[PDB]
Design a binder for this molecule. Structure first.
Ligand SMILES: CCC1=C(C)/C(=C/C2=NC(=C\c3[nH]c(/C=C4\NC(=O)[C@H](C)[C@H]4CC)c(C)c3CCC(=O)O)/C(CCC(=O)O)=C2C)NC1=O
Ligand SMILES: CCC1=C(C)/C(=C/C2=NC(=C\c3[nH]c(/C=C4\NC(=O)[C@H](C)[C@H]4CC)c(C)c3CCC(=O)O)/C(CCC(=O)O)=C2C)NC1=O
Ligand SMILES: CCC1=C(C)/C(=C/C2=NC(=C\c3[nH]c(/C=C4\NC(=O)[C@H](C)[C@H]4CC)c(C)c3CCC(=O)O)/C(CCC(=O)O)=C2C)NC1=O
Ligand SMILES: CCC1=C(C)/C(=C/C2=NC(=C\c3[nH]c(/C=C4\NC(=O)[C@H](C)[C@H]4CC)c(C)c3CCC(=O)O)/C(CCC(=O)O)=C2C)NC1=O
Ligand SMILES: CCC1=C(C)/C(=C/C2=NC(=C\c3[nH]c(/C=C4\NC(=O)[C@H](C)[C@H]4CC)c(C)c3CCC(=O)O)/C(CCC(=O)O)=C2C)NC1=O
Ligand SMILES: CCC1=C(C)/C(=C/C2=NC(=C\c3[nH]c(/C=C4\NC(=O)[C@H](C)[C@H]4CC)c(C)c3CCC(=O)O)/C(CCC(=O)O)=C2C)NC1=O
Ligand SMILES: CCC1=C(C)/C(=C/C2=NC(=C\c3[nH]c(/C=C4\NC(=O)[C@H](C)[C@H]4CC)c(C)c3CCC(=O)O)/C(CCC(=O)O)=C2C)NC1=O
Ligand SMILES: CCC1=C(C)/C(=C/C2=NC(=C\c3[nH]c(/C=C4\NC(=O)[C@H](C)[C@H]4CC)c(C)c3CCC(=O)O)/C(CCC(=O)O)=C2C)NC1=O
Ligand SMILES: CCC1=C(C)/C(=C/C2=NC(=C\c3[nH]c(/C=C4\NC(=O)[C@H](C)[C@H]4CC)c(C)c3CCC(=O)O)/C(CCC(=O)O)=C2C)NC1=O
Ligand SMILES: CCC1=C(C)/C(=C/C2=NC(=C\c3[nH]c(/C=C4\NC(=O)[C@H](C)[C@H]4CC)c(C)c3CCC(=O)O)/C(CCC(=O)O)=C2C)NC1=O
Ligand SMILES: CCC1=C(C)/C(=C/C2=NC(=C\c3[nH]c(/C=C4\NC(=O)[C@H](C)[C@H]4CC)c(C)c3CCC(=O)O)/C(CCC(=O)O)=C2C)NC1=O
Lengths: 160, 249, 159, 172, 162, 162, 172, 159, 160
């Protein structure tokens, strides 16, 4: 769903026409879409650098990459990079849509089930998503970093 | 500017002679005349009964009364026909009737008060409603008192009154200063709880109470649309000749 | 139109390509004209349903005829309510910029619904054409073009 | 006859309370935008006679049987009848923009309009095709800036056009 | 009802002509004063409860017999004092109403229309209410040109009383 | 005759009441526009002779047959052209009169009252005079709010012509 | 009904010339002196009812046979008759100060008033003893140095008192 | 943007949408400015490529180190030719509005290629980022946003 | 957690002493605590009026309080008032702490699970929290209404 599609749905289930508050919501979305698109472009620029800096901030040189940790095996390191790239990409989609429903529908659906099945540590994942959020808020600026951090904190809060 | 469209006059009481003077009842009004002065009680009665026709008794009050036009009437400087023009083209009368009523109902309410007759049909109310619009209200009140039905029946110096209501309700009583379509705007039927009980079960509330959806909401739109379809063809199916009906190429 | 590009780049493993970002920026720019067109179609709804019923029942009198479906005041009120629904979905598609939230509610299963209701679909298409003509008379040239866009989508969809 | 100033009194009398401070901040914006309102009004009345015939170049050209023999705008008095009250729409719409509320317009201009227009025999729907053509010319003049200081009167333009849409709804 | 915007309309409507510059000019004048008139409305609304009980106990001073004489009209009984703050509190409403309207219309239509009829029947002497309004016009604490603004409409109710 | 000071009087006189603040509001309002209206009077009086012969030769441009057709009504010989500058010169007088009065009164009483009667009898087409007044409103050289001021009354004479 | 603005038009029409620049400098002082007229005018109308009874007591206390049995102010409607038109002097003098010229005063209080006052039998000279007592109270209120700001209202005060002297001359 | 819209409406059974026709109209309206940007980038080919390559060697001296790939005059000439190729593809993408010319000429199989050539991917990407910075400094401001966002696609797609 | 406790924790997990950036953060918190306390006092003044005005703005006279809606039964209306009072009270706690962790720990933990279990509409809850935010930003002023709206929008974003 969108913010546009959410506004249209909320006006639809009442049978209501588009009143002035919904037009205010759509015009606010059409105002913010500029920096939304520019932020999505520069996040699509260097996603690999963001994931590299995030694991170098949070996960590297810990016991997690040591033997016994969950990132010791090299296929598990590759799976870690894959999961962080997923979090960043779906946070980019939720930032450009302006509605976190795609995070609820595609990422946060059965994810705690999987992470408790595999024995994946949840707190280290939350700290890695936090480091992702700090790196991309530094990279994109504060004004779009707020909206990026909202959906990354949404993923972090639903994960916990 | 443009002349009056011709409207049909319905048969009413006052188009008839009613012969004689010594024969009519008591209940014909007192035909108060400024030429009859003889006292101040006749002078005060002429002023008060001229307010009676214009403001329907209750309003005369103190504030509404224009004291300078009554100042003048005693002197005799201005005729009674001129004096009703001062009361009718007065904004103490504008806020009371003219703003409040409609151009179609104003024609009905000022003929009963200045000419003393109800309008014949709705076509008469339709006819003068244009003369209100382009000339203004005081231009129309001027046209009523200049009119020859006024001067023939009342004259220059006689207060108006209902002509020949042998078996009819009195005109200040049957007609208020505003009707039912305007009643929510000047009255207080919105805030009185006695009327909301009657509108609670009114058929108009049931059209409001329904949720979004149902074709009963669009039932008023369906009557305005019209466009009924044609009936089936009268020609029988045996006269079709389907084998030779097909055109080649 | 943002959900379209998002699921479009989401089936792929790639990000949103910046040409899609350009089309989102251009839609964001045109959103004010979209909102004015939608409000102009919003406030004048009953005129459009009146003129659509006018032009339809002048065009096809069989719905008026007692063998047709829209016979009587109740059935003709349901008919104009259907035209009201389609005008509402057209305003939704005008705001959304792409025909997904109008096809999801009015197009995707309409043929079997109108088949199991008895009504013909061509008369509904003529009704949306009458709505397009009345809105073309109501709007300016660049507004009627952009409204006749989505009206044209509905007319093509009902056929 | 009501106003923006007097209608926010009249509902405030019906509830019987003193006027709140956010109603006075609302009316302070009404005074603030008052100068803009006046300018729009003077341009309509100065081009008042130019609008009516330019609407009558299309009100009759689009439905050409009306002045052709048989239509209700055919003879000459009948033709001058739909110019004697095409302007009365403009006479009361300009009163509505001056007062700022459509309550003045409703009482006289449209209260009995839809009743006479089936009593006479005139097409009621053939009025509101051309009152829309007045609105297309009225907001074109009121928005255009000629010898005027730059300003934004967009809000007035949309609710100037709302008065024409109310003027077309109760006739059609 | 009487308003400078309304008075421009009803003058131009009875002539059947458009809005000239003479009706339009009148509207322009109202705005300059309406900026200072809304200053006077907030000065009376904020000090409303001080001014009512400031007034209804000032009238008891100059007329001490009104709390002593046993009569329906008299305010000596508690029920009268309950109808005291109602009536004087009705005055500050309509004064604040005629402030923001700019005209005397709401004062002319709600308060003073038919006031000579009602005060004769219920024997309410109009010398009582004029004593309360002199207390209001001296104790509102308003200053500047806004102090002139409330002072006209209070004094306009005074002349209609007598 | 129609003036915002007069319109306050004739409204309050027909009611038989005093001057309220609603009649008295207009006078305050009127002075502010009257300060910019007298700016427009000096702009037309000083440029008067340029504007008349600027106008009466502009109407000869758009209507070249008016100097050619032999008629008492047309301006073929010098007697029509002598009555040309009289008539167009009468217009700038009344426009300057209605400027300093603030209302349309002198324009309503001297110029446009009974103008449809006179133009039908002498066959003077009113399309001539409206062509001269469009030349005046574009070539007076006035600026600011005073340029708006003359532009209403010129356009008010235009609508009364047609 | 004439003005200061309209009377300098009306003689200028009779000579048929354009308005001179020193007439416009004269009217520019009238606009400049315009604010003062309103201030003077509002104080008179706000103390309008207070003047009449205060003026009135002197009017009857100085000539005490008038309300004593026999005088023309004796009975009660006769007494209310010389309060119903004591104020009409103030109703039209305030119109004269508003217009700024006494040409609206001389059609109502000065035109036929001396004719009714002979036929009526009411003393005519006993009016102008008390219209002077109104002027003594009118210019005392209009010139009081209270509130507003200090300014020169002397010119207005002297020709405010000239309107009362014209109001007393055509009755006596 | 015409090819992508046509193949997207080809995957469905329906025609081109009114939204998509608005996209094509806006692309035509911006096409002349895109030709101006292509004019500037064509005429600034030399100094943009040299400044970007030298910015790369300032950032990454590993390639021109003797253990690196771009050691020697011929190898560094081929390095600058690779940057020339990518700037040419960026101009093609700015003109077309799609990124399908950039993709199917220089993106789609570049990882396996530069793996088999021994060349690091990230240094290519840093050189294209240097091209983005240089062409951003040359052009007008929001015009540089347009050029640098296609450059941004190339940079993000190389890594 | 606090903002103080978060700063102390972020300095602690590195083994870092209190450097000047952390002292800047604590001194900014000690500057903003004045309006924090004043805002919390006037929100604790009239919480019932805020909840009443919010349901009168958003939820009343809809289909939600009609039969078939989720607020039709009177125990469900009382539960609605309880949930809105919870959102306002915990937003007050998060405003005075200056850290949204108590919202994540006490409110937003298992709340979407509960609201999808009971069939509670989520969008109407988001609009009710929005009306709460507008009413308290009007009531407290803009300068503290920003910080109140940050945590109320945090609840709204985590709920969606
Ligand atoms: C789009 C949303 C989405 C996610 C997140 C997702 C995750 C996901 N992560 C997995 C494994 C894994 N996930 C992790 C991740 C982590 N372990 C740690 O120590 C770190 C805290 C964290 C990385 C930041 C690791 C190490 C594995 C490897 C377990 C294994 O395969 O043996 C698996 C098992 C199979 C596979 O990777 O291919 C799935 C399905 N699937 C999805 O559809
Ligand atoms: C120009 C069209 C026109 C007509 C016809 C008309 C009739 C009319 N007939 C009347 C009365 C009357 N009309 C009759 C008539 C009749 N009694 C009988 O037995 C006969 C069957 C019948 C006559 C053939 C009677 C008896 C009265 C007096 C009834 C009463 O006063 O109770 C009255 C009330 C008194 C009056 O004459 O003013 C009117 C107005 N007015 C009009 O403007
Ligand atoms: C917003 C998406 C949406 C659509 C499309 C929709 C269609 C719809 N049309 C219906 C009936 C109807 N629809 C029509 C339609 C027409 N009259 C004609 O002659 C033409 C063929 C056509 C319109 C001009 C008629 C006549 C009925 C009543 C048929 C019956 O009662 O059996 C009904 C059943 C009654 C009702 O509950 O309203 C539905 C559900 N409902 C929806 O919620
Ligand atoms: C102040 C509000 C107000 C309005 C608007 C109004 C209209 C109005 N128009 C009328 C007639 C008319 N109305 C029209 C107008 C039209 N007919 C056409 O052919 C055209 C389609 C259309 C104009 C666009 C014409 C030509 C007449 C004369 C018809 C006749 O004389 O039968 C009449 C009946 C006769 C009349 O007095 O002139 C009224 C009452 N009256 C009011 O009080
Ligand atoms: C009753 C006689 C009268 C008129 C006519 C009048 C108009 C008037 N319009 C003004 C301003 C203005 N008027 C407009 C109006 C507009 N600008 C646009 O671009 C829009 C299209 C349009 C509105 C639709 C604007 C923008 C201003 C700027 C100044 C202000 O805000 O007042 C001002 C400010 C003071 C001045 O200009 O000297 C005046 C005088 N004042 C008067 O006393
Ligand atoms: C909205 C404007 C408005 C006002 C102000 C108003 C006043 C008003 N006060 C009245 C009576 C009254 N007025 C008072 C007030 C007073 N008497 C005293 O002794 C005190 C001196 C003084 C109060 C300070 C009392 C005690 C009554 C009842 C007298 C009776 O019942 O005879 C009455 C007659 C009976 C009634 O309905 O209650 C009216 C109409 N009416 C209005 O419509
Ligand atoms: C104070 C305001 C005022 C004006 C302006 C006015 C004009 C006026 N011009 C007239 C005739 C005339 N008007 C004109 C003027 C013109 N004809 C042309 O050919 C030219 C196009 C045009 C001049 C530019 C002429 C030539 C006559 C004489 C026509 C005749 O005698 O039939 C007449 C009728 C006869 C007359 O007394 O002379 C009037 C009343 N009257 C007024 O009271
Ligand atoms: C010195 C104390 C005193 C006064 C004040 C007085 C006034 C006075 N004015 C009278 C009449 C009148 N007064 C007026 C005055 C006017 N009517 C209008 O409409 C005009 C606007 C206005 C003049 C400008 C009129 C018209 C009359 C009618 C009776 C008459 O002619 O005397 C009469 C006649 C007898 C009576 O009314 O009982 C009295 C007493 N008599 C006195 O002994
Ligand atoms: C004692 C001798 C005396 C008088 C008479 C006097 C009056 C007076 N009234 C003034 C202002 C004013 N007077 C008014 C009065 C009004 N405007 C309206 O539109 C209302 C209807 C009316 C009140 C009811 C206004 C609006 C001003 C504007 C300037 C100000 O606020 O003082 C000023 C300001 C300074 C000046 O004008 O030079 C003076 C002098 N000053 C004096 O020294
Ligand atoms: C239009 C799409 C396209 C690309 C991208 C392309 C690249 C390309 N790069 C090559 C070599 C090379 N490419 C580089 C590149 C680099 N030096 C570095 O360290 C940097 C990371 C990078 C500069 C961006 C070097 C050093 C060689 C020489 C390697 C060799 O000769 O073995 C070669 C083989 C020799 C040749 O034919 O030029 C090809 C085909 N060809 C194409 O058709
Ligand atoms: C501190 C954080 C916190 C929250 C929010 C919380 C919510 C909560 N809301 C509940 C029910 C409910 N919650 C709602 C609320 C709503 N439904 C609507 O339609 C509106 C959109 C919305 C109100 C704004 C309603 C109507 C029920 C009643 C369901 C039922 O009990 O039958 C229940 C089921 C049991 C009970 O109320 O006592 C819980 C646990 N518990 C918590 O610990």
């Amino acid at each position: 769903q969108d913010a546009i599609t959410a506004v249209i749905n909320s006006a639809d289930v009442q049978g209501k026409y588009l009143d002035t508050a919904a037009l205010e919501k759509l015009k606010a979305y059409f105002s913010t879409g500029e920096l939304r698109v520019r932020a999505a472009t520069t996040i699509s620029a260097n996603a690999a650098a963001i994931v590299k800096e995030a694991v170098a901030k949070s996960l590297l040189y810990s016991d997690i990459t040591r033997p016994g940790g969950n990132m010791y095996t090299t296929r598990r390191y590759a799976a870690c990079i894959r999961d962080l790239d997923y979090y960043l990409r779906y946070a980019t989609y939720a930032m450009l849509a302006g509605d976190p429903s795609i995070l609820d529908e595609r990422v946060l659906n059965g994810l705690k089930e999987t992470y408790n099945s595999l024995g994946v540590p949840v707190g280290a994942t939350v700290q890695a998503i936090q480091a992702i959020k700090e790196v991309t808020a530094s990279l994109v600026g504060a004004d779009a970093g707020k909206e990026m951090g909202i959906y990354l904190d949404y993923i972090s809060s639903g994960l916990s | 500017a443009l002349p009056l469209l011709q409207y049909k006059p319905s048969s009413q009481n006052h188009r008839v002679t009613s012969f004689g003077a010594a024969d009519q009842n008591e209940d014909t009004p007192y035909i108060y005349r400024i030429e009859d002065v003889s006292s101040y009680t006749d002078i005060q009665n002429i002023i008060w009964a001229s307010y009676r026709q214009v403001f329907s008794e209750h309003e005369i009050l103190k504030f509404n009364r224009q004291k300078t036009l009554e100042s003048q009437v005693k002197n005799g400087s201005i005729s009674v026909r001129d004096f009703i023009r001062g009361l009718a083209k007065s904004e103490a009368f504008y806020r009371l009737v003219v703003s409040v009523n409609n151009n179609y109902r104003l024609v009905d309410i000022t003929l009963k008060r200045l000419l003393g007759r109800s309008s014949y049909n709705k076509d008469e109310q339709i006819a003068w409603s244009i003369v209100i619009g382009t000339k203004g209200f005081s231009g129309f009140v001027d046209a009523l008192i200049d009119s020859e039905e006024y001067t023939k029946n009342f004259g220059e110096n006689i207060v108006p009154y209902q002509r020949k209501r042998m078996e009819g309700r009195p005109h200040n009583l049957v007609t208020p200063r505003y009707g039912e379509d305007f009643q929510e705007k000047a009255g207080t039927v919105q805030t009185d709880w006695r009327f909301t009980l009657d509108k609670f079960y009114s058929r108009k509330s049931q059209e409001k109470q329904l949720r979004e959806g149902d074709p009963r909401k669009f039932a008023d739109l369906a009557a305005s649309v019209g466009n009924q379809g044609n009936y089936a063809q009268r020609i029988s199916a045996f006269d079709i000749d389907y084998l030779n009906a097909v055109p080649n190429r | 139109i943002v959900t379209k590009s998002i699921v479009n780049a989401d089936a792929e493993a790639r990000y949103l390509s910046p040409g899609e970002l350009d089309r989102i920026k251009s839609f964001v720019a045109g959103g004010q004209q979209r909102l004015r067109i939608a409000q102009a179609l919003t406030d004048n709804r009953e005129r459009l349903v009146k003129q659509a019923g006018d032009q339809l029942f002048q065009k096809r009198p069989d719905v008026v005829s007692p063998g047709g479906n829209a016979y009587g005041q109740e059935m003709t009120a349901t008919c104009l309510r259907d035209l009201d629904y389609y005008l509402r979905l057209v305003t939704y598609g005008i705001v959304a910029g792409d025909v997904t939230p109008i096809e999801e509610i009015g197009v995707i299963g309409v043929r079997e619904m109108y088949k199991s209701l008895g009504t013909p679909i061509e008369a509904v298409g003529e009704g949306v054409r009458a709505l397009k003509n009345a809105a073309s008379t109501l709007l300016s040239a660049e507004d009627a073009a952009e409204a006749g866009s989505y009206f044209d989508y509905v007319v093509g969809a009902l056929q | 006859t009501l106003d923006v100033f007097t209608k926010v009194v009249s509902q405030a009398d019906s509830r019987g309370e003193f006027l709140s401070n956010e109603q006075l901040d609302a009316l302070a914006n009404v005074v603030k935008e008052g100068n803009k309102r006046l300018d729009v009004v003077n341009r309509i009345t100065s081009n008042a006679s130019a609008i009516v015939t330019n609407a009558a170049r299309a009100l009759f050209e689009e439905q050409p049987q009306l002045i052709a023999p048989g239509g209700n705008a055919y003879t000459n008095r009948r033709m001058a009848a739909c110019l004697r009250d095409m302007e009365i729409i403009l006479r009361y719409v300009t009163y509505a923009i001056l007062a700022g509320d459509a309550s003045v317009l409703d009482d006289r201009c449209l209260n009995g309009l839809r009743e006479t227009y089936q009593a006479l025999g005139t097409p009621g729907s053939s009025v509101a095709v051309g009152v829309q053509k007045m609105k297309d010319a009225a907001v074109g003049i009121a928005n255009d800036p000629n010898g005027i200081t730059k300003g934004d009167c967009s809000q007035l333009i949309s609710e100037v056009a709302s008065y024409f849409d109310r003027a077309a709804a109760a006739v059609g | 009802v009487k308003t400078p915007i309304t008075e421009a309309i009803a003058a131009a409507d009875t002539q059947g002509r458009f809005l000239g510059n003479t009706e339009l000019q009148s509207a322009r004048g109202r705005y300059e004063r309406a900026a200072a008139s809304l200053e006077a409305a907030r000065g009376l609304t904020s000090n409303a409860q001080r001014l009512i009980d400031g007034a209804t106990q000032a009238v008891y001073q100059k007329f001490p017999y009104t709390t002593q004489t046993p009569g329906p009209q008299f305010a000596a009984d508690s029920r009268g004092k309950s109808k005291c703050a109602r009536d004087v509190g009705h005055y500050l409403r309509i004064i604040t109403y005629s402030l923001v309207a700019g005209g005397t219309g709401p004062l002319d239509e709600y308060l003073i229309a038919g006031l000579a009829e009602i005060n004769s029947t219920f024997d309410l002497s109009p010398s009582w209410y004029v004593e309360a309004l002199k207390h209001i016009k001296a104790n509102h604490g308003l200053s500047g040109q806004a102090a002139n603004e409330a002072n006209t409409y209070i004094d306009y109710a005074i002349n209609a009383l007598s």
